[PDB]
Amino acid sequence: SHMCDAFVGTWKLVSSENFDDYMKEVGVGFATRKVAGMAKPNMIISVNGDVITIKSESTFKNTEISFILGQEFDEVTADDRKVKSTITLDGGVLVHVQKWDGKSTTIKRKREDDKLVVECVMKGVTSTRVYERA
Numbered sequence: 035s036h037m038c039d040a041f042v043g044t045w046k047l048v049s050s051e052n053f054d055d056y057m058k059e060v061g062v063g064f065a066t067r068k069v070a071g072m073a074k075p076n077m078i079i080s081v082n083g084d085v086i087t088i089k090s091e092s093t094f095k096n097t098e099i100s101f102i103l104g105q106e107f108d109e110v111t112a113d114d115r116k117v118k119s120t121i122t123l124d125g126g127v128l129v130h131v132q133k134w135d136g137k138s139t140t141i142k143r144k145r146e147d148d149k150l151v152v153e154c155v156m157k158g159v160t161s162t163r164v165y166e167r168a
């Protein structure tokens with residue numbers, strides 16, 4: 035058993051708070067914010083050995099990252115940022131830091147009851163995205 039076991043599986047978005055403001059702070063333009071804000075992504079998390087794969091699938095975009103905990107990697111985000119990413123475990127929370135253009139945002143995935151709760155922080159702006167098993 036590993037701490038990431040609690041995240042493995044297929045998840046669907048069930049609620050979103052303050053996501054438009056978060057995307058604004060990140061620098062997402064108007065049209066992409068409107069279309070991305072409508073999306074109800076599925077999140078698919080799998081593990082093979084040390085490699086964790088996270089997929090986000092929606093009408094807006096299909097994205098996929100594969101990584102090893104603590105090893106920085108290149109990521110092109112759904113809103114087309116080219117970022118440097120590192121994902122680590124903090125207790126049982128997956129902590130994802132993205133850095134680009136001297137900016138930084140942090141995305142934390144945690145298990146709360148039967149939900150997977152995502153907290154996205156950019157400067158002073160915090161958004162919460164709640165996923166349930168699909």
Ligand SMILES: Cc1cccc(Nc2cccc(Cl)c2-c2ccccc2)c1C(=O)O
Nearest residue numbers: 057070073075090092094112113141152163
């Ligand atoms: C759980 C999580 C972690 C990291 C990023 C996420 N979404 C986004 C963050 C910034 C900018 C954009 Cl456009 C998106 C986005 C919106 C709609 C569909 C796909 C991606 C999410 C999430 O969608 O909940």
